[PDB]
């Protein structure tokens, strides 16, 4: 397990997930989700998915911004909660951290199956492919191929987006 970079980034990913999963003020939940989105971008970049990581990071920094806008208006509280300002939020945060730590310790020192199967470790570098060819990016062409190959996907996605705009208009009508 060389430089532990992928493992460290995954651990930070889970830590941010625990952070926004304990349900504190939507402000800090958004902060934790931004952190997890950034580290997930890093994880994907380490595997060769530069466009997908940037795209996910780019998509999240926008949706979270809208959420920040909605939280200031409707999710506001006179006293907003942080991870140490409340008993149950701190309890959930500590429980998540300890579950992370115990699963990591058991899977690293031992080889135990949690739900599906077990693991050995030795780093994520082993699963690589040593593929040596190309004046292009395989990910770029795969993503690029949607227009040429995924005509049906483009059709259903565009219809879904237009329908979603209509749905938002109709739902927020009120009266």
């Amino acid at each position: 397990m060389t430089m532990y970079i992928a493992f460290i980034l995954s651990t930070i990913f889970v830590i941010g997930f625990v952070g926004f999963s304990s349900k504190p003020s939507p402000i800090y939940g958004g902060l934790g989700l931004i952190v997890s989105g950034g580290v997930g971008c890093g994880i994907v970049l380490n595997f060769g998915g530069s466009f997908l990581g940037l795209m996910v990071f780019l998509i999240y920094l926008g949706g979270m911004l809208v959420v920040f806008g909605y939280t200031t208006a409707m999710a506001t509280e006179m006293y907003p909660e942080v991870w140490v300002s409340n008993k149950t939020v701190f309890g959930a945060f500590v429980s998540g951290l300890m579950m992370e730590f115990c699963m990591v310790y058991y899977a690293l020192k031992e080889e135990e199956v949690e739900i599906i199967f077990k693991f050995n470790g030795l780093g994520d570098w082993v699963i690589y492919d040593t593929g040596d060819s190309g004046f292009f990016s395989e990910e770029a062409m795969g993503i690029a191929a949607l227009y040429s190959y995924g005509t049906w996907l483009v059709i259903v996605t565009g219809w879904s987006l237009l329908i979603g705009v209509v749905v938002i208009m109709e739902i927020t009508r009120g009266n």
Binding site: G131, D132, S133, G134, F135, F136, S137
Partner: protein
């Protein structure tokens, strides 16, 4: 002045000159004086790795010409 704004703009230009010029100078210095190689795709990286392996000194920029064919 109206030409007394010029000293500040000149100081700005002097400060902004340093990044690019220093980057170019460091790229030449570190890669043997020939414009550090760009590897956007895996083929170029493989070329760099082959050059590093055949250089005999573990530096990719050290180039071996016709004097290695005996």
């Amino acid at each position: 002045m109206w030409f007394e704004i010029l000293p500040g703009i000149a100081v700005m230009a002097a400060c902004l000159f340093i990044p690019g010029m220093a980057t170019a100078h460091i790229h030449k210095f570190t890669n043997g004086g020939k414009e550090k190689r760009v590897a956007h795709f895996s083929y170029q990286w493989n070329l760099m790795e082959r050059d590093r392996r055949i250089s005999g000194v573990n530096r990719y920029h050290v180039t071996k010409g016709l004097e290695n064919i005996d």
